[PDB]
Write a protein that binds this ligand. Sequence first.
Ligand SMILES: [Mg+2]
Ligand SMILES: [Zn+2]
Ligand SMILES: [Zn+2]
Lengths: 1334, 99, 49, 83
Amino acid sequence: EFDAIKIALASPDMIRSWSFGEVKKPETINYRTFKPERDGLFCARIFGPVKDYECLCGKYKRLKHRGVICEKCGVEVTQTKVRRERMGHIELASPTAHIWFLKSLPSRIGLLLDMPLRDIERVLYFESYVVIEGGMTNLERQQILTEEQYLDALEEFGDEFDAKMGAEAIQALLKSMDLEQECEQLREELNETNSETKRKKLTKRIKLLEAFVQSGNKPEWMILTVLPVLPPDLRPLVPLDGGRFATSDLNDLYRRVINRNNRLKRLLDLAAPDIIVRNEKRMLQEAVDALLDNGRRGRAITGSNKRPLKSLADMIKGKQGRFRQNLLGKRVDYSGRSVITVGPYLRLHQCGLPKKMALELFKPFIYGKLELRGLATTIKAAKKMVEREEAVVWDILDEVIREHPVLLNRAPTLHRLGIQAFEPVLIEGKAIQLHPLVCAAYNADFDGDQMAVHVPLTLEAQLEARALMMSTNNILSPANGEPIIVPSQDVVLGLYYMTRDCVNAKGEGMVLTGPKEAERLYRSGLASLHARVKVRITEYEKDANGELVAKTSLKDTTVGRAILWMIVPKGLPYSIVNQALGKKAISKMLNTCYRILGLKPTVIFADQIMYTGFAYAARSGASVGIDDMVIPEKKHEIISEAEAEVAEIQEQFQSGLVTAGERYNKVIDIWAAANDRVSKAMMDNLQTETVINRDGQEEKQVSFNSIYMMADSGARGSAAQIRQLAGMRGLMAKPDGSIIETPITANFREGLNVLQYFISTHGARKGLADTALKTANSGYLTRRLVDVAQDLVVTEDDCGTHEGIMMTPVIEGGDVKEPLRDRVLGRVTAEDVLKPGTADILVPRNTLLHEQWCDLLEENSVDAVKVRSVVSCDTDFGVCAHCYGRDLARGHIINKGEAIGVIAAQSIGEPGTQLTSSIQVKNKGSIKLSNVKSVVNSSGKLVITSRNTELKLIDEFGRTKESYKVPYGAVLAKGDGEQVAGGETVANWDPHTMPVITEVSGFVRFTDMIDGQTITRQTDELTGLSSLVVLDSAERTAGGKDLRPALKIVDAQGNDVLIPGTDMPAQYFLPGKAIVQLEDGVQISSGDTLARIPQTGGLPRVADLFEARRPKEPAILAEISGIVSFGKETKGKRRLVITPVDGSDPYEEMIPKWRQLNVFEGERVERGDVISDGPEAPHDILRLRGVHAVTRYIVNEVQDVYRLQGVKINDKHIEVIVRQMLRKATIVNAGSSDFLEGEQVEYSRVKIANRELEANGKVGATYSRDLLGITKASLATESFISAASFQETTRVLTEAAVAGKRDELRGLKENVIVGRLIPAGTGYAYHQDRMRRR
Amino acid sequence: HARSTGSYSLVTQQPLGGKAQFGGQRFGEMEVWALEAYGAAYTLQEMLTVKSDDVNGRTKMYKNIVDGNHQMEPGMPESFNVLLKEIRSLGINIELEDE
Amino acid sequence: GQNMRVAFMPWNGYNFEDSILVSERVVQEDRFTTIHIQELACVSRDTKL
Amino acid sequence: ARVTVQDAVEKIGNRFDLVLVAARRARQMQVGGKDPLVPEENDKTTVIALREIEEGLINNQILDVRERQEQQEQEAAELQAVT
RNA sequence: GGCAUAGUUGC
DNA sequence: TCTGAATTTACGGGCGCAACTATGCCGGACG
DNA sequence: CGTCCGGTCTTCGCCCGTAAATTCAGA
Ligand SMILES: [Mg+2]
Ligand SMILES: [Zn+2]
Ligand SMILES: [Zn+2]
């Protein structure tokens, strides 16, 4: 019916064309009788009949009179839907200014006339004069006059001279402007002016003028002359208990504006003096402003009980607007709600639906079945039968519920698993019975949580629920490959209790012929559930070509393990049931089952494992008692000696040996050590609490203690909570962050005295407040991310590109936090990966690195792999399937169409709303140095002369196990590439001084130095040797601040020493703040220090990284390579100059004086090499190093936080978000295309233009990508609808209207708002048909 | 609480909110995102077009279900018509172009 | 409220997350039965017609 | 009854075209004129369509051929009564 | 049958 | 005495989702 | 009870971004 939406300014003629009648009277109803007034805001002859096919006068009341209009009162007899659609208009007695275009910041009227917003506001609100047609006088065009100056001009310039007041003057000024002349003049001024601020102002104003001329709109229409009126039914008056009416805000605003309008018209009729009519026009202007975005100027005019009235802009903007309240999310019929319940008898693919809710939801289907069987001819009879709840309706409900999946959806649907489909099962009650396993998916415990039901109706909806939304198909989370139906709390405890061994139990050592008789023994009570025995096992392995090969052996395990093994399917090895089976072990069991067998075996396995876990947890009777929280009886000595150490530290302090701060630190340190040691003693005494032996000598065993069993099993609780139960509950901090000196020394088993509880409640209140005020930030972040990556959809099957990012294991400085296994899993390789030995193609170029390939890759000790990434995919309007890779929700490649932007946004945002000197080598491995330029000095220690030298600890297989950063002037006791001994530090330096290490050997002659002004003389009395310290330009005297001292090495004769490798002399230009202990004329060596130069969060960090905020102290980088030189004498701050060998020599930079520099004056640096220290700006990274550098930086930085919080999300989601960030590119050279010089255009658009031009003879236009934050990336979208639904509705709509933008509605939010099939899943075929047909 | 079909609002022809009045649950924005992350297109369209505020759509859906046929006419949501009229109330001319 | 003989132990998963398993004795004795008084009012407004 | 659709998706490795073709088959079975090609076991048209795809006797192409043949038969028989 | 306030529940 | 830049200051926008109970309200001042 | 026009006192958060006004640093 339509494939695009346009916006543009509303000309008065077009506004009249919309309207079907003028509104003149500010009346609604009689308030005695409820017929509409003559021509009020609620009228009949203007907007339509009150009823359907019934006129106002009652003369004509039937369908036969469709179209005729009566003469008595002129109401066109038709439906009321027209009353819901027909609009009116108001003929304003004076022109009025549109408030959006006046105060859009920037103001369109403000910069279309190039006049300040203050001046335009002053002249619009009838308080300042503006001249028009200045003529041969002493006035300009846009100049502002006051009443005094206006009268002076009137008495001096009484000849032809125009200077009006209010909206009329603005309308005249706009009408007196031709776009082309101004545009050309502005282009010329832009070219010639050479300014940086005026050039920006111009290239904005020129852009506005080009936007106006390009579209069909005209500037003069931004001043209203006819006010559109909303249809009556969209601002209805609902009668209440009594004759009163519900005054809708729009009605009050319309009444005010029309009232002031009629007052102004009447005053104009009798020609009132100027002051009164100007005041009336000002009142009308204010009323119209209030009717539009109310609250921009002055105060929101209130109507009743001192609350601002909603205006139209306030009605289509914000959380309460029609966008986020009735378009992107709507109330839905065929829905319900209730409290949930466990119901553990259900299978994984069904949920227990209450009978009453089932009857209420499926009423139309029951009607249909009743009529199909003929039990009720008329719908009224079926409705009455259903209401009376006969005995036959229940059979109908059972017949229809058979294969009709329903959707269960908990309130905060953070991630896609928050909504899943189940087959209903009729349950007597009033509460939904939900399968226990999916509780982890919903994050829904059973402490009063409520879930909503939804009933799909269409065949497509039912098939979607069955094939996409059933819990059976949602086994693996979309964020990570781990299963999301891992048994949670009671199943895991049951299995842990089952699969365990004690030293001796009933019937220990007997040999069993199979699991079946093991169960027979346990049920009969002959042998305990946990008794070491020998069992004959038949484990089927599928090492053959898809055939299960049996194997019979005699395994030594326990009765419980065999009973469990009776449940496991054929294809799994027995070794996954020979262990204790904690939570992680069970999750790995399920994951391996999915990987090896398929889906149906894993679903049946989940059902059976839940059943057996519950059954044997019940049989275990694993309870908890106050005698189970055993105190460590030996903590008496520990607490006593800790008290003694703090007492002795106080003894030292009162003697005055130690001050207050160091005592505070030492006390905290000793108490932390005591707490850790008490916790360790408790945990040891608990895990080894039980010692059982009756057949001879004693033998220790892992305990049965309820708390320890329930913690080790991983069901609930961890080291922290178990520690807090028995051991001292640790260190608590005051809200200021100051940790209290005396922490809570009593656990929960012993009572917490009053002050300990007071500290504990500090902590708990802070935690709860942090939760309640961090959920807001998490919600905002996930909303922004979803609204960025929503249009991104997998369109192509393979982009056919040879680019990628070198995925490598990431080591923060300790052990391997994330192995290559998880970082290259399910990502198609970019280039062929050779064997580490010699050029053997181990894996092809374009294979999906599934589990076997990754395991083989690990087996061959491969450390570097390059894999196609979403960010480096050149597909237009989407990303190819191969670049994305594995689905991570299924075991296969991503399908063609499945939307990944929303999946990535939800996967990133879900964890947010829940939670968020010496190099001591640790392993035996080789040492290799990358980007190093070292020199051996006299003392035989290596000193490095580079800056980005990272020390890599290589192993015998060639992999790097540890990485560390080596600063400038670091001492290494070993050589490069020579295997070192792990256990002792390999690198040492001073983190408090920056050396001036040399490159040659000789003597010390201070050249270009004059004592008195260049340096300052310090005579240290406590050392006896003076110092020659250089002070800065503003710190040293005014005698020698124009020259920079140079330190040069000479021979025994006095001549200079040449640099090794270059012809120039080797001189070092010392900066200020240099501790040069050496005096003049002292011999030195190579690589010897001459002088010593002295010197975040959780969710906010992720938000700042994704918004691409510029850090406060960014590390300045070098745009282009070349030699480095200094410039002017610090005019404002130090200046730098970089000159390439044959490129742009005069490239310079402006560097602050107060920040320490990094590189010296004799280095040839490469682009992207750090020139200072501090956080690296993402914009600089993208501009200099490239796209891969910035995407890798962002991925690593966010993964740092998400791992520090103990969360796991695959890198695909971060990569696609980063891709969506850098969606805009700025042109630099026009090339042979038609783009402008420095406009910002979509990367895909310029790419396709260049692709078309290269195939032709012309030359494409080179572009420069720019990194945009998530907010700016989503706000600046090709289609205005998405951004308008996002924040800043007023500004986005103003932009679209001014530029006359056009919508292709190719996104997801946009189709959602329009209300058609999504171009993501099953609707992708329909949109393919759309693209085919046109 | 449950609801097949009952009274609707006035400004936007959507189901009422609450249980004191026989209303329906709110398919919030993140719920729509949950469907979009899925391959659920037809279910989403049925959710926010037929079952919410498409007067012709919901009437035809009800009658078809009564007849035993599970098929829908997408139509256009009336809430979008409300938004169009509200933007037109201003000087912003927004209209749906001919296909 | 009331107090009743409670036993801490997992029972066939019917107390999975925090759910509570109630014996039919508690219902029989009617010790959690609660009386709710609801007020309903109809008004005769002097409306037109 | 049905628990999974993994076999059907294995036979149509798209996971979305499966939904559309199954919906078309269910529509043809509900309006419907046609009858199940698999022994109906008291299941709704959705389950019948998915199982019938599982048997491997229907996909997009087979259904398109059947529809083309039906339209050809309508054209022929409608023509015989006309001329 | 829409707004405002208060309180409450799950996160 | 002018003039471009960087800085500072002013001011516009955002601050999660879902659900339930109650009350009070269309306005208080002239024929 | 029936109609009919509308403005003193209130601020009081945190963060970010962008545009307007002020101030360097010269020529
Ligand atoms: Mg809960
Ligand atoms: Zn009439
Ligand atoms: Zn690609």
